[PDB]
Structure formats: C-alpha cells, structure tokens
C-alpha cells in the first residue's frame, strides 16, 4: 500500500497567521490527494480534493498544492474555529490510504487559570472512597503543573488528570485533577490543597480546605 506521512505531528499557530501542513507519499499519486478536517467529537469533513480543488462550501483561506509525492495544505489566516486534526488521503490506486494526521492548535495570548477545589461529598464517603477535585478553568497554554498536598505531604501516584480539547471559541484549555483516597485515609488528615503552577500566574496559586470545617 502507498504510505502517506504527515510531517509536523502538531502545529501551534497564532490566529490570523499562516499554517502550512505537509503530506508526503511513498510513491507517485499524481494529484489524487484529498484533505479532511476533523474537530474533536465530530466526523471528518472533506476540505480539498484533486490536491488543489476546494470542496464546495469550504472557506477560501484553505488551499492545497502539490503533485507527485509532496503535498501541502495551507490555511492562510488561521481562525480559532480551525482547531482540528487534518488528515490527507490518496486515492491514486487501491487501496486508498490516510496519513496519520496533523493537529493544529491556535496560539492565543497567555491566560491564567481560575482554580477551584472541591471536597468529597458526604454521599460518596458512605461508599468508602473520597474523590477530591481540583479544577483549572480557561487557561493558555496547555502546560500546567498541579500538585496535591495532604497535611504537607506531596501526593504522587494517586491522582489523574483530564484536559479538555482546545475551546473553539476562546482557544483555552481546562483541566481537572482528581485525588482519590480511601475514606479511612481521608478522615485521618485535615488540610487538603491543590497548588497550581502556570505561566499566566506570577507565582503558584493554592486552593485548600480543612476537612470538617466550612
């Protein structure tokens, strides 16, 4: 089969600036190459066909070029709604194949997270487990450090993080970190704290609560 290789696995481009994506074929595929846009949670959408023909209803800022083995998708003035994974595809000969995709992030200005901490609910505690949740809301860039402390001890290995996909509308990320303890362990300690390090904060932000206090 003809292998399609997409060069930068990721791209981070400021809004209004030009994004250039590369797709390389292992053999000649002429101009029988298409490009698809796939936003998180959605099906792919045909963008470009015949290497350079814009599909109907696709905005003019999307253009394709190339022939033979080297192809290029250019987004001339990257808009925030263009956050997506972009896939190329050859149909020069059977079997049709896809490239591995290039993920395009919008490089907006730095935004500090708003931080919130949530104690475990009384209802969960009846189950024998305590989940403590730390939320970092609407920040950029994606890189952030979240540290849990329980009565001054850094907790490691007993939390998990989830990060949203970049928000189309404001180009930010949000992040949840969940610290899980047994009820027995939870009730043995007093001070629960989430400390957040991020480029948009002049120094780390701590949100904390004392178990059993309000």
């Amino acid at each position: 089969e003809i292998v399609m290789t997409q060069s930068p696995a990721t791209l981070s481009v400021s809004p209004g600036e030009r994004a250039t994506l590369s797709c390389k074929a292992s053999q000649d595929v002429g101009t029988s190459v298409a490009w698809y846009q796939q936003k998180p949670g959605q099906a792919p959408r045909l963008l470009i066909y015949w290497a350079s023909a814009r599909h109907t209803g696709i905005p003019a800022r999307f253009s394709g070029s190339g022939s033979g083995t080297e192809f290029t998708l250019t987004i001339s003035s990257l808009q925030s709604e263009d956050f997506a994974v972009y896939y190329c595809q050859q149909y020069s000969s059977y079997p049709l194949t896809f490239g591995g995709g290039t993920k395009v992030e919008i490089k907006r200005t730095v935004a500090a997270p708003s931080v919130f901490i949530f104690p475990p609910s009384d209802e969960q505690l009846k189950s024998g487990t305590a989940s403590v949740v730390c939320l970092l809301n609407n920040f950029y860039p994606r890189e952030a450090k979240v540290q849990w402390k329980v009565d001054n001890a850094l907790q490691s290995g007993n939390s998990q993080e989830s990060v949203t996909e970049q928000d189309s509308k404001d180009s930010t990320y949000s992040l949840s970190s969940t610290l899980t303890l047994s009820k027995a362990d939870y009730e043995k300690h007093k001070v629960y704290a989430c400390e957040v390090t991020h480029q948009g904060l002049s120094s780390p932000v701590t949100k904390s609560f004392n178990r059993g206090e309000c």
């Binding site: 959605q42 045909l46 595809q89 609910s121 989940s131």
Partner: protein
C-alpha cells in the same frame, strides 16, 4: 439534507460478533458507493469495508478481511457491517461514509458508533456533587466508576450550555471510567438558580438527574 446515522455499536466479548447499521436519507442511496471507516480512540482513520452501488462486490483491508462483511439494502436505505471474531484492537468509533459521485473521496460521514471489545463488565456510574464554594463560581458533577464508554452530560436539560466543560473520561486503575462535568456561573445566582446535571449512561441503562447546590454549613 444528506444524512447518515450509524447504530448498533456496543460492548462485546473478545471473539464475539456485532452488526452495525447505517440509515441513509436525503439522497438516492442506490446511486452511491459506500464505506465503513473506523477510528480507534486517539488514533487515525482506517477504512475497513467498501461496497458497490448494487452491492455486487465488496472489498476489505487485510486487518479485517475474513471477519467483516459489508452489505446493503437499497430498497430500505441501509448499509450494514457484520463483524465476527472481534479482537481488542477492533475497539473504535465506526463511521458510515458516502463516496463522492464520480470520485474516490468521502463527502459525507455519519456521527459514528462506538464498538468496545473487552471482557470487562458493564457498570453504571454514581453521580456526586461538586458543590460551589464560598464574581464567578464553579460547580459540577463527578460521574464515577462506569464502563463502557460513553456517557452524556447536559445541564438543566440542555438550557445551560455557556461555560460548561465536560471532561474526557479517564480510565482508572480499577478498569472503570470516571469524569467530571463543570460549569462556571455567577456567584449571585447560587441562592436562586437551580443547577441540575443530566447524566445518561445508555450502556448500563443508568439515567440520573443530580441537583448541585452550595453545601449547608
């Protein structure tokens, strides 16, 4: 409008069988060649089955040939994928896709249906409050300990959408998923506005409405 609606995806034992269906509307079905394309979680696109207009011939890649059968019924607007001898690596979202007339591209896709191949048991979530604390306040619901994916979360029956973040599920070491859904709202609303998260885990037949409010102190 052209529309493709997939159905039939669910949780199946390794070695088992599943049949997917795709309902087509808004175009003359028998005029078009059709695809099934799948996408493993966090991975790329892989076509897995192709059928001609009249259904006379079928084609599959090696990863799948001998196990999948694509078929169609032009009289009742439907594409099928029969999947046998399923393996863990067949776990994916499966898309129905129409081939562009007089070309080889895919110009319309369904929303996809998730197929999970696993020996893990179906289990519905518990839903716990993330209560707003002591401007902008945040609150949410913790949707914990369920399998398989997916779960849906809305707020106030869909009336509250602004400021909502429903996080991607993360697999816990128990083999169960958990996620939170949060929303930021005006602090001034906390006494007055009701906030309810509507959780539906269709695989386990688990529907929950959870009202989330400041904790009495």
């Amino acid at each position: 409008e052209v529309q493709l609606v997939e159905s039939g995806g669910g949780l199946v034992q390794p070695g088992g069988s599943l049949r997917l269906s795709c309902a087509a509307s808004g175009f003359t079905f028998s005029d078009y060649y059709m695809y099934w394309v799948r996408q493993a979680p966090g991975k790329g696109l892989e076509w897995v089955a192709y059928i001609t207009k009249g259904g006379g011939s079928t084609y599959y890649p090696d990863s799948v040939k001998g196990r999948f059968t694509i078929s169609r019924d032009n009289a009742k607007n439907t594409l099928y994928l029969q999947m046998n001898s399923l393996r863990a690596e067949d776990t994916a979202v499966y898309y129905c896709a129409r081939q562009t007339n007089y070309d080889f591209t895919m110009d319309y896709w369904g929303q996809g249906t998730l197929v999970t191949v696993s020996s893990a048991s179906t289990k519905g979530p518990s839903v716990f409050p993330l209560a707003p604390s002591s401007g902008t306040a945040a609150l949410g619901c913790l949707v914990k300990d369920y399998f398989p994916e997916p779960v849906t979360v809305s707020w106030n029956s869909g009336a509250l959408t602004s400021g909502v973040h429903t996080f991607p599920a993360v697999l816990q070491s128990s083999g169960l998923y958990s996620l939170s859904s949060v929303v930021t709202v005006p602090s001034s609303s906390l006494g007055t506005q009701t906030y309810i998260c509507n959780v539906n885990h269709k695989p386990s037949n688990t529907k929950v409405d959870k009202k989330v409010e400041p904790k009495s102190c």
